[PDB]
């Protein structure tokens, strides 16, 4: 149908079979495997498995996920382990992508993946900077995006959008100073969610 995205059945079967393959080989760490309706394979693993799972996917002959495309974190405050660490990998040999996910909380360190992918060095610094997730055995873990001395982790869901402090130049002390934030116009929160369900296929149980 002209307006509907076509389904690719062959890639869904292929990625499912490879998902079982990885689950069978790494049972010590793999907690869940799923493939989305648009054919993206996700491996959910225990956080202890970061290095073994990423090394297997990089080096194994049937995996060869040589390129770390992205590494990010998602904050879900309702979860006991609020932070979800997402690794997106690319295999040039098999022209395929895979997503590997794990989790942690505010006080639990994750193992640095710099040994597996040098690309991860700055990504982990950004996750530390913006979410406050510590990576153990990182060559140089420090803020990368925020200002020096910045307090808090702005990408956390409970960090306010405009922050807590703002900058201006003060003539009395002849330097830029930081003061508690005041807004001439407050950001206008909108309630946009319709009170009618949109997607029955995703309904949660009562």
């Amino acid at each position: 149908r002209p307006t509907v995205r076509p389904r690719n059945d062959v890639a869904h079967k292929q990625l499912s079979a490879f998902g079982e393959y990885v689950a069978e080989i790494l049972p010590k760490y793999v907690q869940q495997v799923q493939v989305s309706c648009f054919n993206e394979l996700e491996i959910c693993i225990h956080p202890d498995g970061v290095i073994p799972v990423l090394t297997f996917l990089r080096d194994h002959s049937n995996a060869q996920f040589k390129s770390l495309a992205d590494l990010t974190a998602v904050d879900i405050p309702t979860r006991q382990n609020r932070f979800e660490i997402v690794y997106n990998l690319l295999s040039l040999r098999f022209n395929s992508r895979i997503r590997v996910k794990t989790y942690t909380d505010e006080l639990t360190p994750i193992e640095s993946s710099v040994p597996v992918y040098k690309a991860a060095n700055w990504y982990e610094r950004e996750i530390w900077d913006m979410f406050g997730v510590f990576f153990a055995n990182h060559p140089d873990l420090r803020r990368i995006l925020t200002d020096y001395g910045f307090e808090g982790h702005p990408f956390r869901k409970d960090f306010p959008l405009s922050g807590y402090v703002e900058l201006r130049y003060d003539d009395e002390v002849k330097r830029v100073v930081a003061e508690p934030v005041e807004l001439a116009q407050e950001f206008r929160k909108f309630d946009l969610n319709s009170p009618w369900e949109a997607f029955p296929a995703y309904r949660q149980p009562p």
Partner: protein
């Protein structure tokens, strides 16, 4: 013999068939120290034995390359080297063991 692999930092190999035979044999030797029921051993042994058989039958380097479907023969050598490195690490990690810990009840539920 080629003049270049085409990939910067990847050198041509003068004796690709012999180098591959060494590497696949070393991999199978290392795979012997993994428990027989580990899926890693069974699967890695299967693919290694398929590649080794292809190296035995095909003497022409060009023709062998279309069989292995792994790029330049030097890329195939490099991959065997990585597999051998991986197999050693799996002996320490032992990923064939039961899942270390279950996630909390709603760890992987989306949407919340």
């Amino acid at each position: 013999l080629k003049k270049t692999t085409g990939l910067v930092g990847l050198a041509v190999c003068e004796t690709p068939h012999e180098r591959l035979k060494i590497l696949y044999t070393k991999i199978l030797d290392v795979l012997g120290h993994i428990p027989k029921n580990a899926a890693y051993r069974k699967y890695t042994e299967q693919i290694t034995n398929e590649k080794l058989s292809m190296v035995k039958a095909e003497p022409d380097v060009k023709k062998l390359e279309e069989r292995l479907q792994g790029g330049q023969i030097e890329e195939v050598i490099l991959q065997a080297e990585n597999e051998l490195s991986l197999a050693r690490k799996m002996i320490q990690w032992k990923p064939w063991e039961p899942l270390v810990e279950e996630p909390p009840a709603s760890q992987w539920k989306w949407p919340i």
